[PDB]
Each structure stands twice: as C-alpha cells, then as structure tokens.
Design a protein around this ligand. Structure first.
Ligand SMILES: CC1=C(/C=C/C(C)=C/C=C/C(C)=C/CO)C(C)(C)CCC1
Ligand SMILES: [Cl-]
Length: 174
C-alpha cells in the first residue's frame, strides 16, 4: 500500500542551512551496499557568506580483513531547485579514503533536536530505491527525547526503511 517511490518522498519545507549548521551526532543509520561508516559518527555542518553548505565527518570505518581506522571526511553541497535536496561531493583528507557524489536529502529536521537524512544512490526500474542510505542525527550525543523519536520513527516508515536501521555507538574511538 505504501508508496516507496523516491519521487514521492517528502522533504523538509523551506530548509534553512544556517539553522542546520553545527554538530550533529549520528544515532542510527541504514547502510548502503559496500564500504560505509561504521560508528562513532559525528558530522559538522557549516554555511558560508555565499550560502554554500559544507560539512566534515569523523567516524570509524572497517577496511576489510578487519582493519579499523578513524575516517576523516569532507563534503560540499550543491543546491538544487528543492531547498532540502542537495548533491554532495565528498572525499577523505587521506587520498585513499572513499570519494564520490551522492544525493543528500534533508527529509526532516527541527534544527535543534533531530534530523533525518536520506540518499538514494541508484533507482530501481519502478522508481523505488535500489541502493539507499539514511542517517538519523541528534544534537545531543546521548540521544533523542521521546517526542522527537516518535517523529523520526514516522519518517523512517515513510522512507520505507523503518526495519533497516541500526544504532550507532559513540565510545571515543576517534
Ligand atoms: C561526508 C559526509 C557524509 C557522508 C560521508 C560518507 C558516506 C563517507 C564514507 C566514507 C567511507 C566509506 C570511507 C571508507 O573508505 C554525511 C552523509 C554523513 C554527511 C556529513 C558529510
Ligand atoms: Cl521495525
């Protein structure tokens, strides 16, 4: 019954880059295919005088055969016609870290408590996502208050992802 076409997904009305700036702690994630950030994930968002949003991110990644490594990433966002939908060019401060360019949607936020992010890297032929990821962020590293949690759960369901998240631990690995 639920519409899981990516083109159907609502995102944050009148998204405000300035209000979104600062530190966001990843509390949960739905993983894409392939190498991804593992845990201890913290993002720092900024916006400059011209209005270009950028970010940095720290987090543990496990390069295969179980090598751990605190990845240190940089992201720059290109605006689209939708104020909450961006193209994110990203890379690591080290050359060998993953680079690429992902859709970056702010699905919902209240700016001072929670944010829900979404990226579809590849569509299915029916308009659903073949390869997605999603972060839930909190301003407080100790987690969301119940009212925000309940909103986030609704957004998770709307993205057709609600069963597919895992919690992210923060234990000082970085
Ligand atoms: C950059 C960046 C983001 C995603 C970064 C990613 C996905 C990094 C992946 C790194 C890997 C896989 C390293 C292993 O080589 C998110 C969406 C958190 C917003 C904050 C800025
Ligand atoms: Cl569930």
């Amino acid at each position: 019954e639920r519409d899981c076409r990516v083109s159907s997904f609502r995102v944050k009305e009148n998204f405000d880059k300035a209000r979104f700036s600062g530190t966001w702690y990843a509390m949960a994630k739905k993983d894409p295919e392939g190498l991804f950030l593992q845990d201890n994930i913290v993002a720092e968002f900024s916006v400059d005088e011209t209005g270009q949003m950028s970010a940095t991110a720290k987090g543990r990644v496990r390069l295969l055969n179980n090598w751990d490594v605190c990845a240190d990433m940089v992201g720059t966002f290109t605006d689209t016609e939708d104020p909450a939908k961006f193209k994110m060019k990203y890379w690591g401060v080290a050359s060998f870290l993953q680079k690429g360019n992902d859709d970056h949607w702010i699905v919902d936020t209240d700016y001072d408590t929670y944010a829900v992010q979404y990226s579809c890297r590849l569509l299915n032929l029916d308009g659903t996502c073949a390869d997605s990821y999603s972060f839930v962020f909190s301003r407080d590293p100790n987690g969301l208050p119940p009212e925000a949690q309940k909103i986030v759960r609704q957004r998770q369901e709307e993205l057709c992802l609600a069963r597919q998240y895992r919690l992210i631990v923060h234990n000082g690995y970085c």
